[model samples]
Target: CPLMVKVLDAVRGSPAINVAVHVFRKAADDTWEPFASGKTSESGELHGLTTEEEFVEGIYKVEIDTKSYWKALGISPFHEHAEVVFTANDSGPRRYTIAALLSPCSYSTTAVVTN
Candidate 1:
């Protein structure tokens, strides 16, 4: 029942870039749940998020409001919101965590979680 999360913008010169996170999972019953959502800190890092850990070892996705963020900053984006998806071993450990990195060009993959 213990987990940790941290997100960072790996862009070197991105001063005011926006970053958000959403925890999602496709359950055994084929239902999706919106678990947690939050924006990053001034340092472009999001951490210490608390949520209900009740998901199986399956597919999970986190939706980042990238396009909206760029528009808010008066910048035009070539793409819409970016979604990061990953898988968990279900039978894996509970101390799972994920880290995401983004930039104007591309974004790195997200990590897995536990429940």
Candidate 2:
């Protein structure tokens, strides 16, 4: 499965710029390792990414560093970082697309999976 991350302003639905996003994989020992990292583009879209074959059957984290983004907009961030965690269980050949939508006061995520 693949995942996408995005940031946006809730007021007028404008794309939030320069937002940093990080993807981490949980290790068997309950530790985490960085998988992928990127910043939101002009369209507030970060494309889906593939994880290494070592990463399987563990909790995945999508951490959105909100401080800088909110600061750029001149607003106090409610949470220092916005996090979305989900399980990635790809036993066979499957492709999934998940998106993290981050707003000022709230955050949401949705996904489409295919087998």
Candidate 3:
């Protein structure tokens, strides 16, 4: 897999299961083209978001539905969604792991790229 995601629930101190994740690729016109979407697993991990062929050099966005995730837990969240935009495969083909930490009012994101 060329891309993967991991979500952690800061409040719950565990993996954020069933969180919706959407992947988009920026098109030539600067519009976001839908690429893939999935929900986090029991371990709060989403895998196989894209393959090498489809994961070309370009700008990509990963959107996480943090609002819904918090609402499901009976908490109000400040952010409607959390997103990470970045350029991928610019230097060369690489694996990407997006780690997101979520709270009711704030979130943190990190990317791990490896050859």
User: For each candidate, C-alpha RMSD in Å?
Assistant: 3.8, 2.8, 1.1
Against the hidden reference, what TM-scores do the models get?
Answer: 0.64, 0.77, 0.96
Q: How well is each residue in 2-105 modelled by candidate 1, as lDDT tens digits? A: 43445544445542335666777777787777866777667655555553355456777777776666667566665566676667564666656665555555
Candidate 3 segments exceeding 4 Å error? 90-93
lDDT for model 3, on a 0 to 1 scale?
A: 0.94
C-alpha lDDT of all candidate models, in order: 0.60, 0.71, 0.94
lDDT of 3 by residue, 1-115 (tens): 8799999999989999999999999999999999999999999999988888888888999999999999999998999999999998658547899999999999999998887
Please give the lDDT score for candidate 2.
0.71
Model 2 per-residue lDDT tens digits across residues 1-115: 2556656667557876778988898877888889888888898777756644645667888888877777777777677787778787768435555455565667666766665
Ordered from best to worst TM-score, the candidate numbers read: 3, 2, 1
Candidate 2 residue runs with Cα over 4 Å from true position: 51-55, 91-93
Clashes of each: 1, 0, 0
TM-score of 2: 0.77
Worst 10 residues of 2 by lDDT: 92-101
In model 2, what lDDT does residue 58 have? 70
